[PDB]
């Protein structure tokens, strides 16, 4: 698109600058441009792509939750009717969020996933597919909701199967995948027992492999393990 005339290396350089400046919409546009060059992404580049879109969609998610809450309050009994404006603005934000999710899913489908052969890359991308379908699920209503949930679940499962076969239990990508799939189960799929089971097993298997790690790797793994523990503490 609009980044078609810029060199791939220049797009990556500017993505890094935009991260420093907390200009995440710019960062996302630069990284979309880099993906569209058609070459596979390095580990660092995959992280830049993830940072960019997570910050953009995170802003949208937060705003949507605020607006949804106001809307729900207005639709209580004894609430003075104030017109269509709350619903309209919530729908505007919702549509913009859906559009960001669809952009990310588009990039993964054309053609990041199919060209990803190594476990580290394929699991990263499949986790991301799960995540962005889950964000779509948060705002979906009804029958759309069922198919969106199934799409998220299927992506997460495929990622889990690869990660279990190909990565150590302490691998950060494997841990973050399991963390997010567990939240999926609890918050989206109405399966709190599956959520708790997955988080516990993931934590215990990582604990037993920590002895193999360097000081730096130990720090990376234990950070994500603490997130599993924090959720388990909330849930039990």
């Amino acid at each position: 698109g609009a980044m078609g005339s810029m060199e791939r290396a220049s797009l990556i350089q500017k993505a890094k600058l935009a991260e420093q400046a907390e200009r995440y919409e710019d960062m996302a546009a630069f990284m979309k441009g880099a993906v569209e060059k058609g070459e596979e992404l390095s580990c660092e580049e995959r992280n830049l792509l993830s940072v960019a879109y997570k910050n953009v969609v995170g802003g949208q998610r937060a705003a949507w939750r605020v607006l949804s809450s106001i809307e729900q309050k207005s639709n209580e009994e004894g609430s003075e009717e104030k017109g269509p404006e709350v619903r309209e603005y919530r729908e505007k934000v919702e549509t913009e969020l859906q559009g960001v999710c669809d952009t990310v899913l588009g990039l993964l489908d054309s053609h990041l996933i199919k060209e990803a052969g190594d476990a580290e890359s394929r699991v990263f991308y499949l986790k991301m597919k799960g995540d962005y379908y889950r964000y779509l699920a948060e705002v979906a209503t009804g029958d759309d909701k069922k198919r969106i949930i199934d799409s998220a679940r299927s992506a997460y499962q495929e990622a889990m199967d690869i990660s279990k076969k190909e990565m150590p239990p302490t691998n950060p990508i494997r841990l973050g995948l399991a963390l997010n799939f567990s939240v999926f189960h609890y918050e989206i799929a109405n399966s709190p027992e599956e959520a708790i089971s997955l988080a516990k097993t993931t934590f215990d298997e990582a604990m037993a492999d920590l002895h193999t790690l360097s000081e730096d790797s130990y720090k990376d793994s234990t950070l994500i393990m603490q997130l599993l523990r924090d959720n388990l503490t909330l849930w039990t």
Binding site: N180, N231, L234
Partner: peptide, 9 residues
């Protein structure tokens, strides 16, 4: 806390 998901570097 509330629930947490994976951080981004």
């Amino acid at each position: 806390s509330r629930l947490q998901t994976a951080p981004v570097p």
